[PDB]
Design an enzyme around this catalytic site. Sequence first.
Site, short mmCIF file in Angstrom:
data_model
loop_
_atom_site.label_atom_id
_atom_site.label_comp_id
_atom_site.label_asym_id
_atom_site.label_seq_id
_atom_site.Cartn_x
_atom_site.Cartn_y
_atom_site.Cartn_z
CG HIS A 182 2.64 -14.12 -6.88
ND1 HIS A 182 1.43 -13.47 -6.97
CD2 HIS A 182 3.02 -14.05 -5.58
CE1 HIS A 182 1.08 -13.05 -5.76
NE2 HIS A 182 2.03 -13.39 -4.90
CG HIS B 297 7.12 -12.05 -4.70
ND1 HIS B 297 6.99 -11.01 -3.79
CD2 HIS B 297 6.52 -13.12 -4.14
CE1 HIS B 297 6.34 -11.45 -2.72
NE2 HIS B 297 6.04 -12.72 -2.92
CG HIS C 245 7.03 -17.31 -0.39
ND1 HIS C 245 8.09 -16.58 -0.87
CD2 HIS C 245 5.94 -16.53 -0.55
CE1 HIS C 245 7.66 -15.40 -1.30
NE2 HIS C 245 6.36 -15.34 -1.07
CG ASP C 246 4.39 -16.54 -3.56
OD1 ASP C 246 3.46 -17.22 -3.03
OD2 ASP C 246 4.59 -15.30 -3.29
CD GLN D 149 -0.31 1.26 -2.40
OE1 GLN D 149 -0.31 0.66 -1.33
NE2 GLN D 149 0.64 1.08 -3.31
C1 LIG Z 1 -3.10 -1.58 -3.70
C2 LIG Z 1 -2.09 -2.74 -3.79
C3 LIG Z 1 -0.71 -2.33 -3.25
C4 LIG Z 1 0.34 -3.45 -3.13
C5 LIG Z 1 -0.26 -4.78 -2.69
C6 LIG Z 1 -1.60 -4.98 -2.66
S1 LIG Z 1 -2.08 -6.53 -2.22
C7 LIG Z 1 -0.45 -6.98 -2.01
N1 LIG Z 1 -0.08 -8.25 -1.55
C8 LIG Z 1 -0.89 -9.34 -1.46
O1 LIG Z 1 -2.06 -9.32 -1.82
C9 LIG Z 1 -0.32 -10.57 -0.87
C10 LIG Z 1 0.42 -10.51 0.32
C11 LIG Z 1 0.94 -11.68 0.89
C12 LIG Z 1 0.72 -12.92 0.29
C13 LIG Z 1 -0.01 -13.00 -0.86
C14 LIG Z 1 -0.52 -11.82 -1.41
N2 LIG Z 1 -1.24 -11.99 -2.66
O2 LIG Z 1 -1.61 -13.12 -2.86
O3 LIG Z 1 -1.35 -11.05 -3.43
C15 LIG Z 1 0.46 -5.94 -2.31
C16 LIG Z 1 1.87 -6.10 -2.23
N3 LIG Z 1 2.68 -5.39 -3.01
O4 LIG Z 1 2.37 -6.91 -1.46
C17 LIG Z 1 -2.67 -3.97 -3.02
MG LIG Z 2 1.95 -16.89 -1.74
ZN LIG Z 3 4.84 -14.07 -1.82
#
Ligand SMILES: C[C@H]1CCc2c(sc(NC(=O)c3ccccc3[N+](=O)[O-])c2C(N)=O)C1
Ligand SMILES: [Mg+2]
Ligand SMILES: [Zn+2]
EC number: 3.1.4.53
Length: 351
Positions: A83, A87, A123-124, A292
């Site tokens: 973040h 990103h 947004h972040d 994943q």
């Molecule tokens: C096994 C891993 C693979 C990539 C991924 C995640 S969790 C995740 N994203 C998120 O958790 C997320 C998505 C939208 C908003 C906020 C988040 N977050 O807070 O991490 C990703 C990614 N690259 O967007 C798990």
């Molecule tokens: Mg966020």
């Molecule tokens: Zn984000």
Amino acid sequence: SISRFGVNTENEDHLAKELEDLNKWGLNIFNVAGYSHNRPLTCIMYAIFQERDLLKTFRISSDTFITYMMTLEDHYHSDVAYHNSLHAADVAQSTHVLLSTPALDAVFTDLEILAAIFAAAIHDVDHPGVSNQFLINTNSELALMYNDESVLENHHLAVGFKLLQEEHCDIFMNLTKKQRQTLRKMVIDMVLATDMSKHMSLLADLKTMVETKKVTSSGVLLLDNYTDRIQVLRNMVHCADLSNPTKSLELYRQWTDRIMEEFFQQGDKERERGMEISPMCDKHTASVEKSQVGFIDYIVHPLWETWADLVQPDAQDILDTLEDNRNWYQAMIPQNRDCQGLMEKFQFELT
Ligand SMILES: C[C@H]1CCc2c(sc(NC(=O)c3ccccc3[N+](=O)[O-])c2C(N)=O)C1
Ligand SMILES: [Mg+2]
Ligand SMILES: [Zn+2]
């Protein structure tokens, strides 16, 4: 060295080459990052706005705009693995492309375009690299201030907007009072929608939208009113926030390494504090590959498959890449119960 791209650089030739793909899903923001003295956010936002003639439409000076974006970029923590400003640039650039999709041709006002790209960029902002739930359980000032509700997402808004007040930073200075209150309302709505605890309510509403959609003679979505438009928009931004897995494998593997490292860093703070470790945050036990597949099957694919519906056949390549990346991780591996970690991590809120 010379801000025609609003940033310093010693490879304008490679920066330019890379910004050729500004309008495409395949742009490489890692490369833009490496050729901008790590100002991917300032650089890509400066390109996107000139590309959309947005600085002209809204009388925003180059200086005002670079001064603000630079400051905004300064407010993403460079010591947070995922973040950070890369990103934010990615999500901004991804929203730019989604906005161009043919099913949405001329559906949105210039004001909505401006809001959606700005929301993506902020947004972040000032993300500390830990979750809402972490902040709430440790009684952070932020959780107290926002009553445990979309804590970080409220903070991203306060910060993004607060920075308009810095000397030479008011990129909205030349909007009418009315435009400004409408922009604020739309950005708030979009940034609040990036809270993963809302993912399932978003998705149910997007499905209803899909099931009763209408497309013109041309083939373009008919969006009756404000309510319909801001709903597509909040889904678009959530989609962009969730777009890493739909990008070439070369890019997604990098995004994966980053979020995993940020998760592990939160887990260590949790371990160090005697707390239960959140799912996917325990380096000693996590399995990226297994995670994943589950994350794509339960969260990412259901959403992108609905977005692909909304805008068919525009997002077919996106869906194809997503399925290839899923099968790539699947091949490394030697249902509600199984999804329980994701439910715990994302804390879906009933409505
Ligand atoms: C096994 C891993 C693979 C990539 C991924 C995640 S969790 C995740 N994203 C998120 O958790 C997320 C998505 C939208 C908003 C906020 C988040 N977050 O807070 O991490 C990703 C990614 N690259 O967007 C798990
Ligand atoms: Mg966020
Ligand atoms: Zn984000």
